[PDB]
Design a protein around this ligand. Sequence first.
Ligand SMILES: Nc1ncnc2c1ncn2[C@@H]1O[C@H](COP(=O)(O)OP(=O)(O)OP(=O)(O)O)[C@@H](O)[C@H]1O
Lengths: 114, 56, 120, 122, 73, 104, 141, 61
Amino acid sequence: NLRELRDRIGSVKNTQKITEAMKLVAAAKVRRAQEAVVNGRPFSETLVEVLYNMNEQLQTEDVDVPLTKIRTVKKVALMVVTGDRGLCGGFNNMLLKKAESRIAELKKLGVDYT
Amino acid sequence: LGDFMDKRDASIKEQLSGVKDTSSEVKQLEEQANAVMRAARAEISAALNKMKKETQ
Amino acid sequence: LQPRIVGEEHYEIAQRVKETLQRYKELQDIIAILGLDELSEEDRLTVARARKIERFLSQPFFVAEVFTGSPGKYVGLAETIRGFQLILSGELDSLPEQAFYLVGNIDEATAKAMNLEMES
Amino acid sequence: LQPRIVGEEHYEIAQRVKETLQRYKELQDIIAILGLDELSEEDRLTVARARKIERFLSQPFFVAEVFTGSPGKYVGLAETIRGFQLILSGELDSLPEQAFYLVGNIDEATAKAMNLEMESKL
Amino acid sequence: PLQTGLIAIDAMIPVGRGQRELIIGDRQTGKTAVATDTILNQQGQNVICVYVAIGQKASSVAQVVTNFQERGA
Amino acid sequence: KVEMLYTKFVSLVKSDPVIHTLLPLSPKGEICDINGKCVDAAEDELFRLTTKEGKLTVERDMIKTETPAFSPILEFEQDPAQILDALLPLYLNSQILRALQESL
Amino acid sequence: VSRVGSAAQIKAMKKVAGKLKLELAQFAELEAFAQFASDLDKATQNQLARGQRLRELLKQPQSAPLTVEEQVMTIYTGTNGYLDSLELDQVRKYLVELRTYVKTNKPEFQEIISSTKTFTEEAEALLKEAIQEQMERFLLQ
Amino acid sequence: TIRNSEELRGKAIEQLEKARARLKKVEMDADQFRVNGYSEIEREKMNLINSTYKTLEQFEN
Ligand SMILES: Nc1ncnc2c1ncn2[C@@H]1O[C@H](COP(=O)(O)OP(=O)(O)OP(=O)(O)O)[C@@H](O)[C@H]1O
C-alpha cells in the first residue's frame, strides 16, 4: 500500500501548490478590482459633490421625479449580487441565507418581495 | 326599465356570490375527503399496529 | 447491539448515532483539508450534530475527579434514549459544543447550557 | 508503438489520447478537492474529453456478455482511430459521456447517444 | 443458480451452486451474519450447509447454533 | 424600497453583507439602508490591502470630498427640477456598479 | 466482483437487470464525482437520483431473506423507473408495501415465474399492474 | 364572463361531487384496510403463537 499513499502525499503536494496558485491569482484579481474601483472613484466624487450642491440649491420640494419620491410600502425588491465562482466558502452563500431571512422579514409584514 | 336593470344586476351578483360559495363548498368537500381518509388511515393503521404489538 | 436484544428502539438509537458519526468521519478526512464551509447546508448541519453526539458522549468519570477535577456523573437508559433523542430531533440544536461537553446527563447539559449562556 | 510502424497518424491518435488521459489522471485529485466547475476551462474541456475517451475504449466482449448484458463486439482499428479522431479533436463533445459507455463502435455510440437523448425526452 | 437470501449479492454479484464466492472484509461487519443468512435461506432448495466454524468463540458458535435451532436450519 | 444586497468589504475573511436601499433615493447624500446603516454623506470609503504582517488586511478610509456649491453663476439649461430626473439614473448606475465591484 | 456471472443466476433477473451492476458502478463513481455538485447536467441528475434510489433498493432489514421472486420484483421496480418519481427515502416502505401487495393480490406471478425462471410479459404485466395499484396506495398515502 | 363564472361554479360543484365520491370510496378503502389489517393481525398472532409452540415442541423432541 506504500506507493499508493506515497502518491496521495504527492497529490497533496500538488494540492498545496495549486491552492497557492489560486491564492495568488485571486490576489491579482483583488488588486485589479480595487484598481478599477479607485479608477471609477473620481466619477463618484464628482457626481456626489454636484448632487449635494444641486439638492442644496433646489431649496424647496417642487421636485416630482419618480425615482426618489418616497411612496407607499408596496413590493420591496431584492437587488442581490452573489458569488462569482464556487471556491466561495462561507460568506458568499451566507449572504444568500441572510437574504433568506430578509425574505422572511419581508413576509413578516407581508410586503410581496421581488 | 330600472327594475329590469336592477334585476339583472342583482341576479348576476348573487350568481357570483353563489359561485364563490360553491368554490368554498368544493374546498369543504375536499376537507371532508381529506380529514375522513386521513383519520381513517390513521385509525386503521394505528389500531392494527397497536393490536399487533399487544398480541405479539 | 441487536434489535432482538436491546429493543429495536435502542438498536435504531445506536444506528442513528453510528450512521451520522461514520458519515462525519467520511467527511472529516476531506474537511480538514480545505476548510468548513465547502459542504452542503445539510452536511454542515450533520457535522454539527455529529460533533454534538461526540462531545455529548464525554462521560465525566466518578473516579476521575482526583485527576481532572470534575466529580463524575452516572447515567442510564432514560439518558440513553433521551440525549440521543434531543440531539437527533433537534431539540438541543443551538447550544454550543461546550454545552454538552463533559456532562453525562442531557438535562445536565441543558443546565450547563443555561449557565454558560448566563455567563456572557 | 513506434510512429513509423503504426502509421504516423495512428501514432498521433495514440499520443493525443495518452496526453489528455494522463493530464486527467493528474487532475482528478485536484478535482476531488476543488470541483470540476472551478477547475479551469482549458482543462475542464479535456477532463470531460478524456473521461469520455476511457469509457469509449471500454468495449464489450463476446464472452463477457454474461457479465454485461449485451453481446460484445469485434472492433476494427480504423473504426477505433476514427472514433478517437472525433473525440480527441472535440467533434463528439456534444454527446453524453455514458453514450460512450461500453460501446464497440463510434457510430453505435452516436446511435446510443440518440437513444439516450430520446429517453431524455421520454 | 444458487440463492443468497440477501438482495444485493444475487442482484449484482451472483452466487451459483458450485461457484465458490469469497466473502471478505474487516472484523465485526456481519460476515458470519451474512453467512448464516445465506444458510437459512436454504430451506427448500435441497441444499446441505456445512458451517465449518474455525478458531473463534465457542459462545459465538453456540449463538449461531441457537439461531439455527430458532430457524430450524 | 428596493433592498440591494451586495456583500460588504470590511475584513478579508468575514465581510458581512448589508442590505442597501437603492431606489427610491433620498436627500442628496443619503444612501441609507433598511438596517439603519445610513452613511448618509455620499462620500464613501475605498478599500485597500494593508500589509502590516506576513498577511494582508483591508484599508478603507471614509474618503470625503467638498461641497463646492459649484457655481451660483452656472446656468441651468434644463430647469433643475428637470436635470435631476436624469442625474439620478447616473447615481443609480454608480451605486450599482460600486456594489457590483464590492461584491466581486 | 463475482467472476462467473449471470450464468449462475436466474434468467428472470438476468433479462431484467444484467446491466444494473455496471450502472451502479457508474453511479458510485458519479456520486463520488457529484461531490462537485454545483450545476449538474439534467441527464446526470436523472442518473444520480436513479442510482440513488437503486442503492436505496439495495437496503434490506436484518435477516429478512426475500423470496428470489421478490428480488425480481424489486429489481424490476428499480430498473423500470417507477420509483424515480416517487419519494427517495420511502423506497423501503414502497417496497414492503409493494411486496405485500403483490404477495397478496397477484401471487400467481411469483409461482409462474419461479416455474419458468424467465421474465415474460405476464410477469411484466402483473408487475406494472400491482405497481400502479400500490403506487396509488402509497401516494395516498 | 359572468356566464363563465357560473359555469366555473358548476365545475366547482362537479369537483365537489368528485370529492364526496372519492370520500365515500376512501372510506370504503379504509374499511378494506381495516379488514386486511384484522386479517393481518390474525395472521401475525396465529403464526407467531403456533410456530413458537411447534418450535418449543421441537426443542422438546
Ligand atoms: N443486514 C444487516 N442489518 C443489520 N446488521 C447486520 C446485517 N448484517 C450483519 N449485521 C451485523 O453485523 C454484526 C457483526 O456480525 P459478524 O460477527 O458476522 O461480523 P464479523 O465481521 O463476522 O465479526 P467476526 O468476524 O468477529 O465474527 C452483527 O451484530 C450483525 O447484527
